[PDB]
Design a protein around this ligand. Sequence first.
Ligand SMILES: *[C@@H]1O[C@H](CO)[C@@H](O[C@@H]2O[C@H](CO)[C@@H](O[C@@H]3O[C@H](CO[C@H]4O[C@H](CO)[C@@H](O)[C@H](O)[C@@H]4O)[C@@H](O)[C@H](O[C@H]4O[C@H](CO)[C@@H](O)[C@H](O)[C@@H]4O)[C@@H]3O)[C@H](O)[C@H]2NC(C)=O)[C@H](O)[C@H]1NC(C)=O
Ligand SMILES: *[C@@H]1O[C@H](CO)[C@@H](O[C@@H]2O[C@H](CO)[C@@H](O[C@@H]3O[C@H](CO)[C@@H](O)[C@H](O)[C@@H]3O)[C@H](O)[C@H]2NC(C)=O)[C@H](O)[C@H]1NC(C)=O
Ligand SMILES: *[C@@H]1O[C@H](CO)[C@@H](O[C@@H]2O[C@H](CO)[C@@H](O)[C@H](O)[C@H]2NC(C)=O)[C@H](O)[C@H]1NC(C)=O
Ligand SMILES: *[C@@H]1O[C@H](CO)[C@@H](O[C@@H]2O[C@H](CO)[C@@H](O)[C@H](O)[C@H]2NC(C)=O)[C@H](O)[C@H]1NC(C)=O
Ligand SMILES: *[C@@H]1O[C@H](CO)[C@@H](O)[C@H](O)[C@H]1NC(C)=O
Ligand SMILES: *[C@@H]1O[C@H](CO)[C@@H](O)[C@H](O)[C@H]1NC(C)=O
Lengths: 198, 596
Amino acid sequence: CVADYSVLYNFAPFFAFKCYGVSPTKLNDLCFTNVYADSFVIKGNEVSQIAPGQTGNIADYNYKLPDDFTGCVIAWNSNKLDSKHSGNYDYWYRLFRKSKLKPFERDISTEIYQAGNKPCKGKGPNCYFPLQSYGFRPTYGVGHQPYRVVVLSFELLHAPATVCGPKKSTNLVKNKCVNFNFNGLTGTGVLTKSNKKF
Amino acid sequence: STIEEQAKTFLDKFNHEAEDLFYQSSLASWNYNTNITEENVQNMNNAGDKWSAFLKEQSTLAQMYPLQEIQNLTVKLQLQALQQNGSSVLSEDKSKRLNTILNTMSTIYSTGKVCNPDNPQECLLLEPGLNEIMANSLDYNERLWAWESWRSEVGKQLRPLYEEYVVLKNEMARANHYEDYGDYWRGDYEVNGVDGYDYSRGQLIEDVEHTFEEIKPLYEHLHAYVRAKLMNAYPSYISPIGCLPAHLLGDMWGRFWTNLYSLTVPFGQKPNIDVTDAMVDQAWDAQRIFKEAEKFFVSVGLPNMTQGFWENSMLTDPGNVQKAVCHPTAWDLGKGDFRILMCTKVTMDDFLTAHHEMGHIQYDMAYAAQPFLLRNGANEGFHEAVGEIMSLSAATPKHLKSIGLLSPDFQEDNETEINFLLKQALTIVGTLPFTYMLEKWRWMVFKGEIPKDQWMKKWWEMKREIVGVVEPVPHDETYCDPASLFHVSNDYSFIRYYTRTLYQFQFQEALCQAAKHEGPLHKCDISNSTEAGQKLFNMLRLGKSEPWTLALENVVGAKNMNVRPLLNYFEPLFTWLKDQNKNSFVGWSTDWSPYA
Ligand SMILES: *[C@@H]1O[C@H](CO)[C@@H](O[C@@H]2O[C@H](CO)[C@@H](O[C@@H]3O[C@H](CO[C@H]4O[C@H](CO)[C@@H](O)[C@H](O)[C@@H]4O)[C@@H](O)[C@H](O[C@H]4O[C@H](CO)[C@@H](O)[C@H](O)[C@@H]4O)[C@@H]3O)[C@H](O)[C@H]2NC(C)=O)[C@H](O)[C@H]1NC(C)=O
Ligand SMILES: *[C@@H]1O[C@H](CO)[C@@H](O[C@@H]2O[C@H](CO)[C@@H](O[C@@H]3O[C@H](CO)[C@@H](O)[C@H](O)[C@@H]3O)[C@H](O)[C@H]2NC(C)=O)[C@H](O)[C@H]1NC(C)=O
Ligand SMILES: *[C@@H]1O[C@H](CO)[C@@H](O[C@@H]2O[C@H](CO)[C@@H](O)[C@H](O)[C@H]2NC(C)=O)[C@H](O)[C@H]1NC(C)=O
Ligand SMILES: *[C@@H]1O[C@H](CO)[C@@H](O[C@@H]2O[C@H](CO)[C@@H](O)[C@H](O)[C@H]2NC(C)=O)[C@H](O)[C@H]1NC(C)=O
Ligand SMILES: *[C@@H]1O[C@H](CO)[C@@H](O)[C@H](O)[C@H]1NC(C)=O
Ligand SMILES: *[C@@H]1O[C@H](CO)[C@@H](O)[C@H](O)[C@H]1NC(C)=O
């Protein structure tokens, strides 16, 4: 399809919207193989922990990515929409994972926090459950609020792109020497009205 | 595999749980504080119960891993905290009796009342008038009657209760790793694990005696002046050199002589440096004062308060059914929520109190990033000192000129600084004797040196000696003067202040020295300083990962306590005391008794 990248600039200013493996000026005029739309919620302090290559203690816990992640990851606050004065214990996250994760892999498969002499597994001492409830409040300061984040990977690879930015046009001038371009038909001349029967 | 790996796996969830449940309990308590209703009381109580009970499930597994194979020392200190403040030894009966004694002590002390003389018709409590009858009323007969009646009506009831409480605490400490509950209080400053900074428990008695004696000549010099001024208004009652009666102190416990500022004034004709009168003229209010207090931290460099704090903190008393208690509290809840619940009037004293309260919030916010189990100062007194130094620095005439309420035309001379020096000494120097004597008597009563029937006698043996104040009416074993005191009747260690006062002066002199500031030590503002602010911020975010000796050596390059900054601060006042008391006797007559 045709993907325009001025849509978010219409929207609110997303705080940690950054680009690493792409060209910011050529975004609207670059072709990508596909688009990936990983969208999740992070708290403010560990938002940057979801980083390309620099996998934070949360990235290896929840969602990792390759070193050369091409595209842009957009992060913004969702406090007022997704915060309750009683604590967002419905919004959970594996705060207690054990090792490194792998790119494009949900943590729905639970990685039980098992580290100790106990083969206990599941939940409990030395066998804790990795999942932790965010417990968000709209009254919290910075670093403890639900920054909703999305991974918009701009993958461009061997498969044909077919996902590029739009192209604008200009007016039509007749009976005047001019240059022209019609879907890639260069040339100069005088354009008039014809009576052919295509 | 190892002890540390399993311990940190165990602590991973417990750190978050200690954040969560403690925040829930503190939030219930804070909602009750902002909204005093019965249901808020129930929420506070239930949240505290659930939090403290959940502490047991993790302290049980904390003792499961002993403390003799720990090399990080984070696990070691955190497990020591778990096995001390979430563990106990007393059986259900002994602990129940202890808590019942505490509850009865609090009930009698708070609900105790003294009626007007020769009449049961009208009766008053301690807070409404007794703190003000001593402070304001000066009549001999009325004050003597109120003092005798109140002290009797508290001590006579509470003394056997304290005799039972001390024995129960001694038994609990004996079952603990302490010799006695006196040693249990002596173990608060203890340090272990790091050689060269470990604190010996036996030094606490030895250290205090070192400096206090050297400052004893000063206090009696002050006593050489007070008895001169008091006899100005009380000629017949007071002996020329004898001990002072214990019912005209101006306060119930003889803590301060500053409230006698008018009585003990050096020069009563120079007006005070007052901006409260000028506050109205310049349309000042609470928000302006608090914003300039924030600007103080802005100029020094410490991070300022977030708008989330200013939005929710109650600056003024709502009144009506939305009643509260505006006592200065620097609430430490965490999760970015640090709020101040204190009602502020348009005065310079409330300005000082606002700085004092905001300092502790600053410290808590600075070290909040540390683990919740180590989110503590070096000891009890460092947290107080953090706000106390800024509160003291908020008493500088030059920065008050910078405020604008006090015009720059104000002048510096003898009677705009010496008048403040005497007030500051009466605040600081005058409290030292009772401050040390209370801890001394508590140590003596808990240790067991004194026979029971002599417990009160020793209490009145050192009153004539250390403070130089004698009772106006003898009090036997039935009476208990410390039972009328806040800390003793409610089991609160009083040793925190006798060290915070020593630490704050060193902190203030370090700030004044590293910033290249000249002039007398009573003129020092750190608003336009960066080295002092940075060197304070170095300690601000450290947390509990250091002891108090090491942290104190990170201030002035000296591990242990000292008194040189305190002597230097009142050094012109020391010269004043020496000069003006040439013909007045130095000391006090213990044997003298005004009660015939
Ligand atoms: C181990 O567990 C125990 C629990 O038993 C903890 O002990 C508590 O420690 C806190 C922290 O000091 C104590 O709280 C203190 O209470 C003082 C008394 O306040 C009462 O009275 C006033 C009226 O004067 C009321 O308004 C108030 O609501 C209370 O009813 C306060 O004065 C203290 O505040 C001081 O510090 C702040 C800065 O933090 C200053 O701004 C203040 O001006 C003031 O100087 C303080 O809040 C509590 O009382 C202790 N409980 C018991 C039972 O003793 C230990 O802390 C814990 N050990 C750890 C965590 O290491
Ligand atoms: C002894 O205990 C302390 C406290 O538990 C341990 O401190 C922890 O040390 C690790 C690494 O030394 C820190 O991880 C670091 O995190 C930062 C920021 O995410 C990152 O940039 C680094 O690359 C590293 O991953 C960890 O944050 C820190 N914990 C705290 C609470 O400060 C210490 O490691 C323990 N000693 C040993 C030998 O393990
Ligand atoms: C303080 O708490 C009381 C009760 O805990 C609140 O009173 C309730 O307020 C809600 C909200 O308006 C009403 O729906 C209830 O009917 C009230 N109940 C009672 C018994 O008054 C009170 O509003 C709280 N104060 C503030 C400022 O919110
Ligand atoms: C710290 O610096 C500020 C600004 O440099 C000082 O504020 C000035 O104070 C003088 C006298 O009080 C006034 O005449 C100026 O108008 C003030 N300037 C500004 C920009 O406010 C402040 O006085 C300094 N601190 C101290 C203690 O003097
Ligand atoms: C004080 O807080 C405000 C927040 O409104 C912030 O903009 C400002 O930078 C802070 N001052 C300093 C010195 O950090
Ligand atoms: C007052 O200050 C002046 C400074 O010029 C000093 O000489 C004088 O001794 C002071 N007065 C007293 C009583 O100390």
